[PDB]
Amino acid sequence: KYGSFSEDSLYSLLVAELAGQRNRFDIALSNYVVQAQKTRDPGVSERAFRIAEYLGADQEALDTSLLWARSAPDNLDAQRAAAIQLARAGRYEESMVYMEKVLNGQGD
C-alpha cells in the first residue's frame, strides 16, 4: 500500500517540510525538487510541483510537472499540469498527447 522511506530521502523530505514551515521556502523547494527527481514518486513530485508553483519558479515547476506526469500519467491533473507547463515552455506535441488523454477522460 505504502512504500518505505529511504533514509536519505526521509531526512531530506523532513528537513524540507520543516524549512517550508519556517518560511525559508528556498531550501524546502530545492530539497523537494531534488528528492522528487531522486525518487520519481507521484505524491512527492506533486507536492514539489505545488511548492514550485507557490514560489512562482518556472524551470523547477517545469521539471516537477514533467516528473509528475511521467511518474503518474494516469492522473488527469498531472496531464493538465504538464500540458499547460510545456505549452508555456513551447513544445506542443506532448501537450497534444496530454490533451488526447484528457479527452479520453471526462475533461475539456
Partner: peptide, 12 residues
C-alpha cells in the same frame, strides 16, 4: 508503491 509523504507532513 507511493511514499506516505502525508505522514511526514503531519509529523512536521
Amino acid at each position: 508503491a507511493p511514499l506516505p509523504l502525508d505522514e511526514l507532513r503531519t509529523f512536521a
